[PDB]
Amino acid sequence: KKVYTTPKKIRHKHKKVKLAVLNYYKVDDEGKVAKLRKECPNCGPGIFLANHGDRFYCGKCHSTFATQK
Template identity: 70%
Template sequence: MKHEETIIGRSGSLLMGPIPTPSEGSHIRNSITTHKRKKKTYTKPKKIKHKKKKVKLAVLQFYKVDDSGKVQRLRKECPNAECGAGTFMANHFDRHYCGKCGLTYVYQKAGGD
């Protein structure tokens, strides 16, 4: 026995013809795949990411003006050709480091180590 349905609009006119019922195989397949996923509960709070701090007038750390008006560089310039002129190396407690190319000069300890 076949079950058919027709859809009729407000005015009584026929909107769609008979709708065939789905076959048994497609009905079973749809009922298996339509489960809603359970919401995940988080155990730890979100990690707070590091934000870069803007240093105002940071160029003043690279140069020093003498009493005579002569300009002196306080940082070492990177000798690598790909960095170019005006690229300064960072001063760390045990090394000089270029942030652009990764060149590192490690200080030698005077104690023999």
Template identity: 55%
Template sequence: MTKGKKVAKYKYYKIEGDKVVRLRRFCPRCGPGVFLAEHLNRYSCGKCGYLEWKQPQKKEE
């Protein structure tokens, strides 16, 4: 975890009615509770180092 920095947990969840919606994906290795960081071209886990590349989106004309 980061030393001396606060984690903005409100960015990971959203409340809809009486339900909590998780906005980020979970790490498939670590399981629920560990979110993947979203970068421009990949998702990565800071705990175990799991890396998943994003699929390039095709532009429709």
């Protein structure tokens, strides 16, 4: 064996980031159940569309979506 070279550049993974969890669902005045954004057509409700500038995707399908809404 020889000496280890080490050209630096140490990269770490992704630690999720805990965040505020849920905000994309609302109740107006009790009775009126109100949704933010839109649900997935490929798989049933419980999945929201990820809203960008003419870019949409879902997490149960991991990525598979494209159409603007």
